[PDB]
RNA sequence: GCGCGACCCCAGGUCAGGCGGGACUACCGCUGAGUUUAAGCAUAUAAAUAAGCGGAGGAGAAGAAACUUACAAGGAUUCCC
RNA sequence: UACAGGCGAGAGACCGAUAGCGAACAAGUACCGCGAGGGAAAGAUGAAAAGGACUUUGAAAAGAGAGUCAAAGAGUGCUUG
RNA sequence: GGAGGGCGCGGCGGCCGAUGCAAAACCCGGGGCGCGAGCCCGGGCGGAGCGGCCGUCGGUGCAGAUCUUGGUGGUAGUAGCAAAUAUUCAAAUGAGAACUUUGAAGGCCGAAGAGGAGAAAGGUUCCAUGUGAACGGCACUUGCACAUGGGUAAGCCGAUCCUAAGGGAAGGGGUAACCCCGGCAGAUAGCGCGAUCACGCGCAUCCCCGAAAGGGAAUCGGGUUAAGAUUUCCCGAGCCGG
RNA sequence: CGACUCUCGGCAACGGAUAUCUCGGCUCUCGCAUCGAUGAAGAACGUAGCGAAAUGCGAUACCUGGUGUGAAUUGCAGAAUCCCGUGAACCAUCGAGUCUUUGAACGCAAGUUGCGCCCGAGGCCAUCCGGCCGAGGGCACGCCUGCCUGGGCGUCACGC
């Protein structure tokens, strides 16, 4: 069999993978100031992603 | 507080508007006091500036510098003038922000639309005085 | 390009036929700047934002032209599945526009129907 | 063997799966219904006993709303003005 | 079907296959097998690719 | 048969148009608990309330008496005292 | 006559970051749960980054000098501490 | 337990004072006052607003509540880090090597494997390169970590197509309604085939989903990269449907 | 007899209380009416030169026309015509627009980017003036109104 093929789940996996990226240095200056320590970067070994 | 059914009055609201300044808000807060020679020509005490003006530091510690206005910054309402600077450790020179109120206008570029501002405000000052 | 191309009022002063040829060129040009996106060129920098705006301008104006011609054709007859959309903004406002008040008092009690003070006095 | 350890370890069945409408794992597969909005369903699932936290989720915040707002503001649907054209027009008032 | 037509319009070449890949980007990567009668190398130069 | 009109009843991806869902603060209906209180608890209380469900508007409902009264009679409807 | 929503306003012997809303900050976010649902922690350098070049030790992180600052007994553990 | 007379805090109306030439705050085996509640003053720290007095008012005073929330001890450098037969030597590298990497050696699982793969599940973890701040409860230059890049290509494999148990629109009818049985006057309401020619002929229990396991239109070989290759690629040969 | 045990101060480390701040909350009051099959509320996934996020937007994609203002945007890069100007701007206004994939969600289903049907034009060549291929958008339930082929002694006349 495939490894659940359905597009609705598949797109979310792609989106979340893109989302789980670090905050990019430059923007911390172009926010004024406020510690942009993302939060929406998760790691697979810990927690669980809901659909 | 003091009187009148109007839109605007709230200590929080006054701060909120002027910090993040929409374009009309920027220009009215970009009004910088004229030097005395210019005050008697255009018959106003203050007008919005430009970038091809020249502006002299009167108020601060930095007093005595003159330069052209290099940039104007919306996001934290500040203006940046040439030669009012602080030195970084390596020897780089970076501009120090100055408020438009502090600095006083040496020289004007008239323009055409900016010129219209001078005429309307001048007419304003004529009406009350006489 | 490295400079921005053109201004909206210029495109207004060009024909529908002229601007569709321009639109083809803009799309071709965009694909060049997309490969240069990877390169990080100073040429594409400003330009790749601005070319999308150029594409948008030509598409808006041609559509507006079609609607104008359509309206002139339609105004004689009974009409509009398209212009009807713009006129209303539908459902709540649609129920409120029979015109009730005038129509009810169009017949029965209308000869004498209102207070004088003037009007009935002035006109006799 | 018994409870907890053996309860966790199997889990090779699926019930609640991704809903298309609301984007929440709540679609009960073998009874084909979403328990977070109703997926086949004429009406969206609304409960007025389900209080603070849940109600606000369904109120949304990925909303448009601004697009809708502008017709409320004007109330009309027209306007007309094309000033600022070489002549020097009427494009600098007072 | 559409992409084979598009390649023919814009680069004047016959395409023999098109192959479709989902990416984690959320867009589709296309490997497009081209004709040996006009070589992909000399197509490449005018829309440069590394 | 064919019955001009039509009678009665069907069918159009039919001609021009219309309905669902939302909002549900507030409102108009429907439908409807128990904890609680009675130092217990059923009648009763909570409450013709909460929950459940539908539907509109900027307000809505109401509305020119098959009324109130028992008077030298008041006088649609609403809200406050 | 109504108005704990929405939009656009005016105010309060309101609260002052364990308080105030769940959320002053990316908050209904991160995260938790199979789900229904549950749901945080988290504001302050300074006037201006003037966010410590350079020299030196150390594998580096750092340290020591120095530079800067009105003040580093203000060095993004940052006002007071 | 009552009443009485006070003290302290926050804010408000009054009134008076204090301040970058150093406010408030905080510290102080420093002084002094009051029975106390508390107050006063000095020195140190600090850097922008505050206190006294007369009225007014409270979300107004803490030691607890198997208290709530945050911090921090003793415990304690103590219990421990003991299952899985097991490591060792030399070299390479590096600042640093019992653990990395290579060889040599010793072993172990003992083909119902500690194996080569697929399902399910996770989602980039695979591999390169960079590389030790956190993390791998030892260590560490190594990592399934962190950073930076790349990678999954099908007429023939699966899904798709198809039916099952079963689910569910459509009808009638209850139920305000949600919702539930489930079809009816698709039965002289139309879907299907000739048929191009407009017309005739024929028929239901419909119609979709439902096993990425049932059932099934159709591929093999070699080569390749970081990897599964009938599958990517390529040669050569097919095979199925239109 | 060091030490230990204890205690304090001075300087610190610890910790984030306290004070002083506050583009915020909170509560009251006022004005206002204004969603949708003409495709909503809500979601999904993309789009910024360099973006993870928020915010903005939708293949016309951090935006467009038009209009106002009248020169910035800024972390760095950049354009230099857009600077005495039909015109800068994470700008405001935003009347004219696009407005993806979904969703009441409508061809039919949906653990399927699944499976149909219909129409458009451009090109081809005439095994026919047809065949083949192209890009776009439709084709639901519900019921009114008007409409056609008719069912039926439903009812009448007229049939041979």
Curated annotation (Swiss-Prot), chain C:
Protein name, as recorded: Large ribosomal subunit protein uL29
Q: Could you state a single Gene Ontology molecular function term?
A: mRNA binding
Q: Which UniProt keywords apply?
A: Ribonucleoprotein, Ribosomal protein
**Where is coiled-coil annotated?**
none
The similarity annotation says: Belongs to the universal ribosomal protein uL29 family.
Read off the HAMAP family from this record. Ribosomal_uL29 (MF_00374)
Question: Which BP terms from GO are recorded?
Answer: maturation of LSU-rRNA from tricistronic rRNA transcript (SSU-rRNA, 5.8S rRNA, LSU-rRNA); translation
PANTHER family assigned to the protein according to its UniProt record, in alphabetical order: 60S RIBOSOMAL PROTEIN L35 (PTHR45722), LARGE RIBOSOMAL SUBUNIT PROTEIN UL29-RELATED (PTHR45722:SF2)
Q: Name one Pfam family in it.
A: Ribosomal_L29
Q: Name one GO cellular component term.
A: cytosolic large ribosomal subunit
* Cross-referenced InterPro entries: Ribosomal_uL29, Ribosomal_uL29_euk, Ribosomal_uL29_sf
NCBIfam families given in the database record? L29 (TIGR00012)
